[PDB]
Structure 1
Amino acid sequence: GLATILAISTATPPNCVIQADYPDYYFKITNSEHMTELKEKFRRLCEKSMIRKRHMCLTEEILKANPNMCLHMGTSLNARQDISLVEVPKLGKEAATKAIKEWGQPKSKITHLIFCTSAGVDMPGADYQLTRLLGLSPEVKRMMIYQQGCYAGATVLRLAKDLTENNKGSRVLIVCSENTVPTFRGPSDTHIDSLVGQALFADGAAALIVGADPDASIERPLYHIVSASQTLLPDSDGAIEGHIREAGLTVHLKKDVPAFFSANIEKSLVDAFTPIGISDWNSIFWIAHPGGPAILDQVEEKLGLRKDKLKASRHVMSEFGNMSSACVLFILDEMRKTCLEEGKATTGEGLDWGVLFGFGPGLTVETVVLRSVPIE
């Protein structure tokens, strides 16, 4: 009996942010409307982001109160920490509440808790904050995944698979919770790649229950975590870097990070699926972290995916933005849900085998082979 995903649920801050209105509002509130060339640069980024809206607990009101989070390098870590460390477990609890409610079991049957965030660290961490908030057993075995960035959505299923398979009867609550409080800053023309960050990053929390050997009479499998791998890309050092600094979380990118992922992604597909005997990347279903459209576009190209292998992935991208570790989890709610409503054979867009990708610092590719479960 494999680690089986029994329930999923998501939560986002109330404040919707329309990407069409963002380049004006951003350069208004960062008092930069005279970098007209940079403003148009950022307008192009936002239009090609393929993100309709984003959710952000960070509002205009909070930003007016903290001017230094509106500068590019404003001394602002404390102010961000003060917001973010409350907001991370809070918005994680909203999602967790609903995921338990869907799972249909008392919270005292949750033996393990995996919490994951890059929006700020603390001692004790958001694992403790969330355990106190939900009222879980004081004996829950917790794993606190801090600052692992955008591949960490698959990390948390790679973690949970081992936790749950080596501990008969166990049930893991996973909570990913992410926000832009530590990364929001004003623009700088010595630092264009931070504009890339400002066009993509959103807030979002996702929660799962994972357990092996599900009880057929009281819980409903959605996916089976078959395998999970992790690899570093050759010659990719420095491509993504993020430092926690007196100015918050500074994020420094390279232009050809979309090229590193596309070039190398088949290596991971071959490593994972060839021993299974699967070689046609269109014959599987697809979850891929929408880090940027350029990542997903180029993997679609290099591999020859039909125009809609990545529908669910790009859909969550446009409706929510880059919510770091949560995206891959949101995408599985969308596709699990949408299949049922459109009545496809399996939660895997009718297909049997699936792949789930996380991309982030290293550069790192997390490769999770899934199995769908039938519908109706």
Structure 2
Amino acid sequence: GLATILAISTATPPNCVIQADYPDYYFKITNSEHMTELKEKFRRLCEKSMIRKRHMCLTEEILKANPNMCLHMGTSLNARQDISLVEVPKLGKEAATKAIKEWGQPKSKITHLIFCTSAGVDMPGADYQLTRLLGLSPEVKRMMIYQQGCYAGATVLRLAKDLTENNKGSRVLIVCSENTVPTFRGPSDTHIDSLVGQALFADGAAALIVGADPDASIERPLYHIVSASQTLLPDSDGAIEGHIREAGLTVHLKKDVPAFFSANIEKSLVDAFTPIGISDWNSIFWIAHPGGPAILDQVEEKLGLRKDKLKASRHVMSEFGNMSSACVLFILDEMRKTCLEEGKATTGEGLDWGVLFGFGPGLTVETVVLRSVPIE
């Protein structure tokens, strides 16, 4: 009885920004059009991002009401909190409602809730807000995963596996909800790494139902969570940092983040798949947190992946940008929907075994081994 994903749904705020137009908009809304060379640098970041569009509850109108958010380091945490702390459970509820509808069982059967966001902290947390918004049972067992950044979409699966497998009959609702409200800020020609965030980060929420021992008469498995690991990369201290400050969430990068991930990723593959007898990385299906396009390019190069292995991952990046923890969950939804639509033999692009990677601060790699489910 492995933890099994039984439903997936997603949600995004209606407001959408076209990446091709973002450099003009961003340098206008931040009053930085005189920064002609930095605008060109940002234009190249956006072109290289391989993102077509991003959803953002931050509208021009809200930014106009919050000018300190358009500065690079304007005092603005309170304004960011006021917006984000409402948005996070609101967007998460939209995804959760759809996931519960697909699942088809009463919400009273939800025994556990995992909520995950890096978009703003509060007491009680977004898990409490979502519980009240959805009308979950007051006895729902909640785990609130705050501020773990971009690997946390795999973290919640690692958590959900132990929760559901140790508690017979349990059904876990997972909700990840992320947005750019804490990180949006104006440009600085001494903080280029902050510009990278302005080119990549986006809003989105994903919700899943997870449970061991599915009842085949009422539930439909999509993926089985076989194993889940976490590791810190050698000599990587300080590569990615995010600080929660009076100016909001500031982001700090070293140059060769992609090099660390690509140089170390095969060790996670070896540890996870050699015990199963698997060594051909093109023979498994892939879900890779795509928030750094260079990371996927370099992993693909390093391992010699066929250019289609990362297609669903890069697809979600193109249509949605870096939604932090939400991305890998969006990608799972994309994969199982595409495989059903195309008559593939399994929810894992016709393959039996799969890998799901989360990447983020540490540097941390989360490695989840999945089994697909046959499609008949």
Distance 2:359 2:292 in 1: 10
Shift in Å, 1:30: 0.1
Which whole-Å deviations, capped at 9, do the CAs of 1:320-362 have from their partners, x for residues lacking one?
Answer: 0000000000000000000000010000000000000000000
Aligned partner of residue 366 in structure 2, secondary structure: strand
Which whole-Å deviations, capped at 9, do the CAs of 1:225-269 have from their partners, x for residues lacking one?
Answer: 000000000000000000000000000011100000000000000
Q: Residue 7 of structure 2 aligns with which residue?
A: 7
Which whole-Å deviations, capped at 9, do the CAs of 1:77-103 have from their partners, x for residues lacking one?
Answer: 000000000000000000000000000
Which whole-Å deviations, capped at 9, do the CAs of 1:159-209 have from their partners, x for residues lacking one?
Answer: 000000000000000000000000000000110000000000000000000
Shift in Å, 1:54: 0.1
Distance 1:182 1:23 in 2: 20
Which whole-Å deviations, capped at 9, do the CAs of 1:252-304 have from their partners, x for residues lacking one?
Answer: 01110000000000000000000000000000000000021100000000000
Q: Residue 311 of structure 2 aligns with which residue?
A: 311
Q: Residue 203 of structure 1 aligns with which residue?
A: 203
Aligned partner of residue 368 in structure 2, secondary structure: strand
Shift in Å, 1:142: 0.2
TM-score, length-scaled by structure 2: 1.00
User: How large is the Cα RMSD of the aligned pairs?
Assistant: 0.3
Aligned partner of residue 324 in structure 1, secondary structure: coil
Q: Residue 298 of structure 1 aligns with which residue?
A: 298
Distance 1:255 1:156 in 2: 28
Aligned partner of residue 10 in structure 2, secondary structure: strand
Which whole-Å deviations, capped at 9, do the CAs of 1:102-136 have from their partners, x for residues lacking one?
Answer: 00000000000000000000000000000000000
Shift in Å, 1:371: 0.2
Which whole-Å deviations, capped at 9, do the CAs of 1:42-83 have from their partners, x for residues lacking one?
Answer: 000000000000000000000000000000000000000000
Structure 1 unaligned runs (5+)?
A: none
Distance 2:254 2:227 in 1: 30
Structure 2 unaligned runs (5+)?
A: none
Q: Residue 357 of structure 2 aligns with which residue?
A: 357
Distance 1:14 1:62 in 2: 14
Distance 2:260 2:30 in 1: 32
Aligned partner of residue 139 in structure 1, secondary structure: coil
Q: Residue 127 of structure 1 aligns with which residue?
A: 127
Distance 1:74 1:95 in 2: 32
Which whole-Å deviations, capped at 9, do the CAs of 1:123-152 have from their partners, x for residues lacking one?
Answer: 000000000000000000000000000000
Distance 1:291 1:53 in 2: 13
Distance 1:208 1:94 in 2: 12
Q: Residue 178 of structure 1 aligns with which residue?
A: 178
TM-score, length-scaled by structure 1: 1.00
State the identity %.
Answer: 100
Distance 2:254 2:304 in 1: 25
Q: Residue 163 of structure 1 aligns with which residue?
A: 163
Aligned partner of residue 283 in structure 1, secondary structure: coil
Distance 1:292 1:53 in 2: 15
Q: Residue 374 of structure 1 aligns with which residue?
A: 374
Distance 1:115 1:297 in 2: 30
Aligned partner of residue 184 in structure 1, secondary structure: coil
Which whole-Å deviations, capped at 9, do the CAs of 1:198-222 have from their partners, x for residues lacking one?
Answer: 0000000000000000000000000
Distance 1:239 1:205 in 2: 26
Distance 2:158 2:231 in 1: 13
Shift in Å, 1:12: 0.1
Distance 2:334 2:68 in 1: 37
Q: Residue 289 of structure 2 aligns with which residue?
A: 289
Shift in Å, 1:318: 0.4
Aligned partner of residue 275 in structure 1, secondary structure: helix
Distance 1:303 1:33 in 2: 42
Q: Residue 323 of structure 1 aligns with which residue?
A: 323
Shift in Å, 1:363: 0.1
